[PDB]
Design an enzyme around this catalytic site. Structure first.
Site, PDB file in Angstrom:
ATOM      1  N   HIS A  60      19.053   5.275   4.013  1.00 47.12           N
ATOM      2  CA  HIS A  60      20.263   6.136   4.144  1.00 47.12           C
ATOM      3  C   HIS A  60      20.777   6.324   5.425  1.00 47.12           C
ATOM      4  CE1 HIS A  60      23.320   8.927   2.485  1.00 47.12           C
ATOM      5  NE2 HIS A  60      22.820   9.811   3.470  1.00 47.12           N
ATOM      6  N   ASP A  62      23.216   7.844   7.954  1.00 48.67           N
ATOM      7  CA  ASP A  62      24.670   8.742   7.986  1.00 48.67           C
ATOM      8  C   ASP A  62      25.587   8.247   8.885  1.00 48.67           C
ATOM      9  OD1 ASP A  62      24.235  10.663   6.003  1.00 48.67           O
ATOM     10  OD2 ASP A  62      22.375  11.015   7.100  1.00 48.67           O
ATOM     11  N   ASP A 174      23.730  10.757  -1.969  1.00 48.04           N
ATOM     12  CA  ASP A 174      23.828  11.886  -0.953  1.00 48.04           C
ATOM     13  C   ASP A 174      25.217  12.916  -1.029  1.00 48.04           C
ATOM     14  OD1 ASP A 174      22.020  13.480   0.517  1.00 48.04           O
ATOM     15  OD2 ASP A 174      22.913  12.847   2.443  1.00 48.04           O
ATOM     16  N   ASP A 311      16.045   8.546   4.841  1.00 49.92           N
ATOM     17  CA  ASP A 311      16.941   8.459   5.866  1.00 49.92           C
ATOM     18  C   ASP A 311      16.536   7.756   6.992  1.00 49.92           C
ATOM     19  OD1 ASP A 311      18.211  10.410   4.290  1.00 49.92           O
ATOM     20  OD2 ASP A 311      18.314  12.027   5.723  1.00 49.92           O
ATOM     21  N   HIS A 441      30.227  11.901   3.959  1.00 47.95           N
ATOM     22  CA  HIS A 441      29.672  13.209   3.320  1.00 47.95           C
ATOM     23  C   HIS A 441      29.438  14.348   4.552  1.00 47.95           C
ATOM     24  CE1 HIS A 441      26.385  10.059   2.938  1.00 47.95           C
ATOM     25  NE2 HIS A 441      25.572  11.220   3.382  1.00 47.95           N
TER      26      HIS A 441
HETATM   27  N1  LIG Z   1      20.308  13.807   3.509  1.00 45.32           N
HETATM   28  C1  LIG Z   1      21.085  14.613   4.839  1.00 45.32           C
HETATM   29  C2  LIG Z   1      21.775  13.391   5.473  1.00 45.32           C
HETATM   30  O1  LIG Z   1      21.929  12.111   4.751  1.00 45.32           O
HETATM   31  C3  LIG Z   1      23.092  14.062   5.644  1.00 45.32           C
HETATM   32  O2  LIG Z   1      23.973  13.431   5.033  1.00 45.32           O
HETATM   33  C4  LIG Z   1      22.822  15.641   5.203  1.00 45.32           C
HETATM   34  O3  LIG Z   1      23.946  16.525   4.962  1.00 45.32           O
HETATM   35  C5  LIG Z   1      21.881  15.668   4.273  1.00 45.32           C
HETATM   36  O4  LIG Z   1      22.505  15.371   2.829  1.00 45.32           O
HETATM   37 ZN   LIG Z   2      23.705  11.592   3.981  1.00 45.81          ZN
END
Ligand SMILES: N[C@H]1[C@@H](O)[C@@H](O)[C@@H](O)[C@H]1O
Ligand SMILES: [Zn+2]
Ligand SMILES: *[C@@H]1O[C@H](CO)[C@@H](O)[C@H](O)[C@H]1NC(C)=O
Length: 1014
Positions: A60, A62, A174, A311, A441
């Site tokens: 994951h 971000d 997520d 993550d 997100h």
């Molecule tokens: N899992 C964490 C990260 O991946 C961000 O997107 C946070 O807001 C939380 O959801």
């Molecule tokens: Zn996230």
């Protein structure tokens, strides 16, 4: 066309009905804290019926959160992708799924040719599979469906061009709560499957007990089921490894091999993973297979999905090895031990779904049908994630402004083919990408660290400048005699003038049109209307003299009104908030009338005294202890008075009454009708002093809100023939009610300043007998019925208000439309309320590591529509949807897609024309050309232009409203040679159209068409 109002769909699970029945008790379910001790019959699986297990590795990433996009890319993601390339290349059976194309494209373009070829090969062979394929994994609460489609399209167009693949399975692990807008867009974009994770723990428990975690998710109004998209909801508390192998995190944690110590990670359940060996593999497998069989009991087929990731995982080579090797040992043992009757392997998301549907076709399972949404999410106890429906509201509003500028820039420039030197495609791509990135997100949700928010803001600011450059070059080319048109592609022929962004009191950024006998007598301005129907709207500009008149390009006079330029000041000396008038700039307002998807030119000319067709507003300052307010040459002297109730009426519109504090108290629709009570009030929510604290994600109020103490605020009343308003300086909010003859426009300049641990809410109190029902929209696409549940805490009854909300009874409806997504609810019959800003000192324990203390002034805008609906044909009491009236829909369009205004920059515009698009068809009011985008560069022999057409559904309330023309987008550009219906991303042709005619779409449907021109 299906009727979307009168037939209640028959579905197995309807979320509003489920909510009414569920008890939501939060009981300790054992190792599965929010579930129960799962039991299974070991005899269920045997030699003729094995459990096929797919372990799906993932990471994951971000696109900004605790670090900016570029900081994550440099510190983590480029290493994750570089090591994925190497490890998958070297280990043929290892698999990996990737969701975020913004990062993938950033990486791929930096790869040398030899590595680009190795990456294409591992995608081509199925080891690396893109899931969803959007620029980001967007928020699903605050995002507008148009931006969800833009970002999906940006990532999938890149994937088709460079990787030659288009994902048909979506992975959304997520977003904080899930919206049916996703299956809506995905199913119209070629998708066959989708996966979601963050849904209320009570919903996971309830569906798990009925094995309804996999369902065909159709839209709430879809009676036939053609919008259905197979959906898999994950069952547990998190997508991390401890919550994905099965019900017991203490056991699953032992199967995240990155947690043995050297990586700085450990198992909070106090039992660490242990390296798999020949001596412990039977015992470790027995533990793991038992978790798997328990997870399997929650689903209907013999095919099991086991995500393996967390993550920014799979960063180091040692991490790839430690996970792959240990799992390969487990699979070799398990698959060769017949008594487990399991065949386990690394797999991709598509592989899992293909096998599930093979099971389905073999008659082994039938899936339930479901409609509804998954808001508002709670991950545990009373921690409902409704705070992010409002967090960082300045950028939420910026999202909507850029949403519109992107559409306008793409549409204005689509009419022509441009030389590469004009850098049109370059600027548009930058704008689409920065807006797409913000759909993330942690972007629009307002849950990123302060410096990351700043990075998104800078990116959007550059995107806005790119849009302006493209739009103004396009206007100049569309409105200049062709044989005179002489473009300098770096020159600013026009500057945009935006009255609502950043907004008066947020930034003095608007330019004043400077006219004068000794410098310049007149100035051309041009309005663009992106909507496909003729439209009139008042527009205003700042001018250096009050003696200005307006004409159209046939020199016909246009009625205009001049008002002062008022700015509000928190006077630190007198300790009052009051307005000051400019003695050198004034506002001129007039009605512009613009063709569908077209332009209209006007001229403002100065004279030495009051012009015949320009009127001047009167102004009245109500406060005790007034001082003079001179206004330069403004012709009407400001009047003063003690605070008192007032009443205003513009045109034939409603008559609004205000309290002596400058707040609405009633609306009278017509001369005769009653003064319907509609009161605005500002209140404040606080934070709990013990227990969990509100933060960027969570809203945990210390009880119902308390009224903001108003004192005796200064109220300014401006009364004009075209526009009047009442503005009041309240603590933290300059609140303004603007009247132009229809539903009023409300604007709040919100500056929560340093009021720590406070959430400011704007509430409407009416006598409408709505009971416990109210409606809110989902992504600006559809309105869903909400039922206030007193069995849930106040924060659970908050829902996203991405663009509108309403309450109604048998006779009356009040709709509040918004120009930005905010959170809101109806906490008592007859009320509507929507949060304006929130400033929180504490972190809420979800990883952000800070509160929300970076508030800045933001100008929120709304339209308030009070209507009689007793004659409207509405859905029955059991229907889960609601629909707007024509007036409410047009008021929403006035907020989200206003006319664009351009001021000619030089002194004279040679070759200027007065209008563009007068021959464009003016389509029925419920149809929109959501997107108009030229898909080919100028060197393409066959030009292609894509259109996204969306038809909403408006209530039939008795007004005949016809006289419109059929809109055939395929014939908007000349020399059409082919017309095709395509998926919404324009990537796949679905239908070759006869006569090259694009049929219009049905209510609540969206279609895409591409016209080809020789
Ligand atoms: N899992 C964490 C990260 O991946 C961000 O997107 C946070 O807001 C939380 O959801
Ligand atoms: Zn996230
Ligand atoms: C792209 O994928 C298709 C489908 O597998 C394949 O036939 C084609 O050769 C690939 N490359 C091209 C021609 O773009």
């Amino acid at each position: 066309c299906q009727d979307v109002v009168q037939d209640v769909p028959n579905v197995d699970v309807q979320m509003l009905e489920l909510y009414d029945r569920m008890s939501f008790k939060d009981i300790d379910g054992g190792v599965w804290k929010q579930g129960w001790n799962i039991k299974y019959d070991p005899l269920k699986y045997n030699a003729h019926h094995k459990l096929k297990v797919f372990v799906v590795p993932h990471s994951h990433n971000d696109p900004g959160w605790i670090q900016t996009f570029e900081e994550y890319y440099q510190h983590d993601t480029k290493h994750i992708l570089s090591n994925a390339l190497r490890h998958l290349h070297d280990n043929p059976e290892m698999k990996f799924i990737w969701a975020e194309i913004s990062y993938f494209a950033r990486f791929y373009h930096d790869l040398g040719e030899n590595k680009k070829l190795q990456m294409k090969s591992i995608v081509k062979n199925g080891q690396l599979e893109f899931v969803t394929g959007g620029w980001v994994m967007p928020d699903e609460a605050n995002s507008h469906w148009r931006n969800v489609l833009l970002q999906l399209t940006e990532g999938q167009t890149w994937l088709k061009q460079f990787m030659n693949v288009t994902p048909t399975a979506s992975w959304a692990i997520d977003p904080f709560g899930h919206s049916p807008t996703m299956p809506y867009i995905l199913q119209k974009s070629g998708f066959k499957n989708m996966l979601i994770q963050r849904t209320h723990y009570s919903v996971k428990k309830e569906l798990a007990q009925q094995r309804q975690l996999e369902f065909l998710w159709r839209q709430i109004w879809d009676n036939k089921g053609d919008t259905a998209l197979f959906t898999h909801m994950m069952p547990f508390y998190s997508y991390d490894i401890p919550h994905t192998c099965g019900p017991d995190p203490k056991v699953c944690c032992q199967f995240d091999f990155k947690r043995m110590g050297s990586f700085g990670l450990s198992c909070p359940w106090k039992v660490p993973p242990r390296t798999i060996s020949d001596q412990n593999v039977a015992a470790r497998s027995d533990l793991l297979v038992d978790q798997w069989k328990k997870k399997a009991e929650l689903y209907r087929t013999n095919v099991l999905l086991i995500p393996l990731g967390d993550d920014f995982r799979f960063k180091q080579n040692t991490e790839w090895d430690v996970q792959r090797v240990n799992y390969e040992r487990l699979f070799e043992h398990i698959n060769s031990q017949a008594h487990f009757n399991v065949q386990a392997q690394f797999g991709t998301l598509q592989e899992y779904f293909d096998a599930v549907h093979q099971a389905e076709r073999a008659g082994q399972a039938e899936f339930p049908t479901l409609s509804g949404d998954f808001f508002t999410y709670a991950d545990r106890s009373d921690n409902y994630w409704s705070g992010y429906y409002t967090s960082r509201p300045y950028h939420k509003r910026m999202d909507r402004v850029l949403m519109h500028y992107v559409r306008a820039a793409e549409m204005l420039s689509a009419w022509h083919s441009w030389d590469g030197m004009a850098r049109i495609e370059e600027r548009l791509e930058q704008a689409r990408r920065e807006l797409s990135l913000f759909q993330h997100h942690d972007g629009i949700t307002g849950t990123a660290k302060t410096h990351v928010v700043v990075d998104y803001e800078q990116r959007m600011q550059e995107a806005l400048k790119a849009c302006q450059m493209v739009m103004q070059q396009s206007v100049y080319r569309l409105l200049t005699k062709p044989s005179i048109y002489s473009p300098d592609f770096s020159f600013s022929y026009f500057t945009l003038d935006d009255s609502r962004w950043p907004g008066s009191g947020v930034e003095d950024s608007r330019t004043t049109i400077i006219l004068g006998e000794d410098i310049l007598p007149s100035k051309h301005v041009v309005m663009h209307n992106t909507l496909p129907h003729w439209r009139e709207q008042l527009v205003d500009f700042y001018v250096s003299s009050p003696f200005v008149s307006v004409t159209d390009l046939a020199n016909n006079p246009v009625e205009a009104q001049v008002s002062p330029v008022w700015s509000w000041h928190h006077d630190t000396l007198t300790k009052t908030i009051h307005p000051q008038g400019s003695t050198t700039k004034y506002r001129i307002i007039f009605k512009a009338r613009v063709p569908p998807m077209g332009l209209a030119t006007y001229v403002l000319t100065i004279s030495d005294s009051k012009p015949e067709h320009t009127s001047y507003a009167s102004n009245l300052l109500l406060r005790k202890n007034p001082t003079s307010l001179p206004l330069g040459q403004y012709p009407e002297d400001v009047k003063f008075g003690d605070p008192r109730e007032i009443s205003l009426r513009v045109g034939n519109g409603p008559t609004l009454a205000f309290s002596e504090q400058g707040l609405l108290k009633s609306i009278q629709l017509t001369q005769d009708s009653p003064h319907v009570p509609v009161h605005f009030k500002f209140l404040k929510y606080g934070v709990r002093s013990h227990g969990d604290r509100s933060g960027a994600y969570l809203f945990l109020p210390n009880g119902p809100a308390s009224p903001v103490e108003l004192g005796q605020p200064v109220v300014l009343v401006t009364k004009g023939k075209l526009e009047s308003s009442v503005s009041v300086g309240l603590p933290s909010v300059v609140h303004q009610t603007i009247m132009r003859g229809g539903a009023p426009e409300i604007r709040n300049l919100v500056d929560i300043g340093s009021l720590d641990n406070t959430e400011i809410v704007m509430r409407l109190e009416t006598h409408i007998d709505s009971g416990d029902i109210f409606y809110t929209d989902l992504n600006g696409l559809q309105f869903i019925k909400r039922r206030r549940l007193d069995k849930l805490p106040l924060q659970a009854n908050y829902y996203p208000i991405p663009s509108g909300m309403f309450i109604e009874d048998a006779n009356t409806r009040l709709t509040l439309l918004t120009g930005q997504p905010l959170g809101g609810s109806s906490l008592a019959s007859g009320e509507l309320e929507i949060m304006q800003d929130r400033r929180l000192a504490s972190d809420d324990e979800r990883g952000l590591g800070q509160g929300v203390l970076d508030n800045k002034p933001v100008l929120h805008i709304y339209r308030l529509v009070l209507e009689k609906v007793n004659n409207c044909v509405r859905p029955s009491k059991l229907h889960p949807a609601g629909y707007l009236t024509s007036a409410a829909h047009k008021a929403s369009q006035s907020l989200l897609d206003p006319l664009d205004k351009f001021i000619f920059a030089e002194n004279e515009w040679i070759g200027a024309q007065g209008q563009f698009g007068g021959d464009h068809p003016s389509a029925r009011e419920d149809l929109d050309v959501s997107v108009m985008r030229r898909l080919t560069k100028s060197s393409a022999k066959t030009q292609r232009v894509g259109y996204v057409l969306h038809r909403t559904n408006l209530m039939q309330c008795g007004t005949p409203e016809e006289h419109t023309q059929k809109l055939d987008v395929c014939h908007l550009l000349p020399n059409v040679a082919r017309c095709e219906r395509t998926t919404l991303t324009f990537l796949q042709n679905l239908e070759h159209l006869d006569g090259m005619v694009a049929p219009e779409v049905c209510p609540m449907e969206t279609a895409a068409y591409v016209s080809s021109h020789s």
